[PDB]
Amino acid sequence: VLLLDVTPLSLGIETMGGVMTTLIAKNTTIPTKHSQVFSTAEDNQSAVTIHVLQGERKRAADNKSLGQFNLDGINPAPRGMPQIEVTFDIDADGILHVSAKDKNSGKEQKITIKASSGLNEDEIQKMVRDAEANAEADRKFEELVQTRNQGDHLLHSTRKQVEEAGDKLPADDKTAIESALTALETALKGEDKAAIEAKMQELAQVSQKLMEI
């Protein structure tokens, strides 16, 4: 064949930290479908939002929003336990169907996005040029977000351990840990990955007794 229909930009959803995660790649032939299971980042999250995006940039905020919906009623469970399957399906007429279904509860929600939605030819070209001009920056953004999300987890899991060690943790250890958590919490708000990693390292160095238990 010498011509065919494709979807002209990547399609996906916003994930933790403001990132666009791709479910269908740019220039994929239509019709097409793809699913991916996602979970929750923190304990006891019972409601989630699926924000649908078109584009090639790593910051969700720089892509074209196509719509959104929420999924409610998920049993409050530990971080990473919910299994929420997200399915993008584009039919032969360019209509995009997005669904999310929580496997434990069977709760489901969906949206239909019409084929004329999203960016036009000129904005499509501009998007691809902008993503190429910002490729290094977007890579660095994705690496910062991966570090931030790790560091966020380390703060939470450390505070939980401090709480449950209680008395068994010497005062001087708890003082050192408390001060390292503060520093890490500060570094996470900035945009220097190595500063965050350095603060994780300083926290591990004062945490050894806390992980003896």
């Binding site: 916003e14 933790m16 996602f38 979970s39 929750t40 980042a41 999250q45 939002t49 991966q146």
Partner: peptide, 8 residues
């Protein structure tokens, strides 16, 4: 990793 945003 495939995690949704935290609650608003």
């Amino acid at each position: 990793l495939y995690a949704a945003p935290r609650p608003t």
